[PDB]
Amino acid sequence: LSEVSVQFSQLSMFPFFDMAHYLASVMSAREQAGALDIASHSPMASWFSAMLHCFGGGILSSILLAEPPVGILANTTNIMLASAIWYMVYYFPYDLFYNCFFFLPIRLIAAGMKEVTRTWKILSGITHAHSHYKDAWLVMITIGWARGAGGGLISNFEQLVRGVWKPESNEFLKMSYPVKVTLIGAVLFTLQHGHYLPISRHNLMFIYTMFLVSIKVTMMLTHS
Amino acid sequence: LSEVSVQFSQLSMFPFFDMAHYLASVMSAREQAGALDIASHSPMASWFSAMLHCFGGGILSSILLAEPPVGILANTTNIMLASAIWYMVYYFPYDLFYNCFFFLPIRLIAAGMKEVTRTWKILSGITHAHSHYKDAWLVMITIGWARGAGGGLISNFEQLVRGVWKPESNEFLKMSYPVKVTLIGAVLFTLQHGHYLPISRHNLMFIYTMFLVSIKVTMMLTHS
Amino acid sequence: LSEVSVQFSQLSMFPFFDMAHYLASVMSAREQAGALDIASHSPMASWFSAMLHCFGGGILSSILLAEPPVGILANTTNIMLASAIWYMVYYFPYDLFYNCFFFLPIRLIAAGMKEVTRTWKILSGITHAHSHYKDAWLVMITIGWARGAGGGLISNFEQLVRGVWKPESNEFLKMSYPVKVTLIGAVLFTLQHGHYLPISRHNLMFIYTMFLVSIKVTMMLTHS
């Protein structure tokens, strides 16, 4: 029944899903060590650290392609869409916002939708790298990987923003779960582009997103 | 009497004022902790650290706009104009140069003129961001702020140049005086170009520069 | 006998010599402190650290000229030509690869040919900076120097890749031998393109390459 994958490919991420990636990234950034004290004594550094979690994919993909990183800041609709979630995750009265979204079902849905935004970011970078370099496989893998787990790769300098400098925790030394999955996804969809992978994009799109959501759901379920 | 602000808007900064910003930035870089030993044992690192104080506004504004940072190095007239001040601040015979400009009236004039160069840098980055992005308010604020206090934002990596690594002293954690004033100035003049602020450009230019020079003059006076 | 310098001005570096620079850079990167443990437990970090040694010249010259650093990754022939040397230097059976190239005559030839690749990289960056900026001397010096000893200037962040952070060992504080030689070469050949240096390009090319190979051969001979 390939008619269902065609319906899944018509999804738009501007309203609902972009907020889910921004919320899951800001909440996961708050749950990190010493992030509450940053927002309590320095809202500017905690906000910029949240933007590195939300738009880290577009920032790294722009720096690697010699594209202006301020161009991501031009979309005032998206920047304000993530800043409002940041202010509510940290500075909501009675912390009713975080306590509501920390609930297990709501946290599963929000995180699972961020996994969906990761897919289109990978394909965005792969097709965008194709616009700059035609059949260069390594460029498309790099930019698609840069948009999939951008915040995970700038995580070393993102830690430097909040104040913690950990030179021993490099992403290439121990590839974390999201970064290595984005690497696998970037390679697969580059072969999907490259036509070396015998499957349509939309079917590979659906099965990779499902294989990603199912794992993180299982992780968040087996963790609590 | 708005006829005086029109006369003030006609200042050219190429001869006198650019040297004032370069001198105030190089001298303030020397007075930092452990800067004399850098120039005495490694003139290369102290010179580059001085260039990050002088041209830090243009460097950060070029990196944010994907513009070549080496383009700032193209103006050999400006680079030599700051390197000559660097060599005289550190390596002048009998230190007659620094001892002359460390005098309170001369230090007040040189620093007060750097406050004037900060204004045109803010407006240069706001109008330059307007050339790249029409009515994007956040881009004009970012680039105008990047040229106002550029050396203050790269201060973390500028410290890494001389050899001091302070991951705890982030500019976003505690906003210093010059950086936060440039932020206020970048926001005000951005509302001016967007015509959201009910005042002419020339008058807002003059009152902001005066409000800036008067504060630093008061600071340098109340400090000695 | 200027008839021999013309025959030398004609070496093509695509087959033999590019592998020599990649081999000498990867082997010298392995001989660094704690580099074997990186490749044994984190092949991704050791590979990227090896690429920063091989293509650090092109990477830094691209970042300084606002050119896409991923553009160096487009040449899959050159990237695979260096990654194969990386895998054989580290993961060859019985380490027969490193033990063969660590032999003194073979190590002298491989390192001496990397010194030849350094020459064309300096001239590549000088002529490339001439294409972006006509008679800008400082830009031609910077880019030619950026291609000559690129891995030596990103060495601070390259150390951050493998996991070691030394904020005290800056290249400008104590200029190493290869970096300061590339600076001298970048200045000499910049005076050549500007015709301020009374010598033909081909002759200055040959005498500078010989003066560089003879020194490193003497160093490797007096070190063992």
Short descriptors:
potassium (chains A, B, C); transport (chains A, B, C); membrane (chains A, B, C); 0% strand; ion channel (chains A, B, C); mainly alpha
Secondary-structure map:
Three copies of one chain form a homotrimer.
Chain A: H1 3-8, H2 16-30, H3 35-41, H4 43-54, H5 56-64, H6 70-74, H7 76-91, H8 96-101, H9 104-132, H10 137-148, H11 150-153, H12 155-162, H13 177-193, H14 201-223
Main location (chains A, B, C): endoplasmic reticulum
Membrane topology (chains A, B, C): Multi-pass membrane protein
Subcellular location (chains A, B, C): Endoplasmic reticulum membrane
Q: What does it look like?
A:
- Chains A, B, C: GO terms for molecular function: identical protein binding; potassium channel activity.
- Three copies of one chain form a homotrimer.
- With about 220 residues, the first copy, chain A, is mostly helical.
- Chain A has one domain (about 1-224).
- Chain A has helices at about 5-10, 15-30, 35-40, 45-55, 55-65, 70-75, 75-90, 95-100, 105-130, 135-150, 150-155, 155-160, 175-195, 200-224.
- In chain A, helix 10 (about 135-150) runs antiparallel to helix 13 (about 175-195) and helix 13 runs antiparallel to helix 14.
- The interface of A and B includes residues 41, 73 and 160 of A.
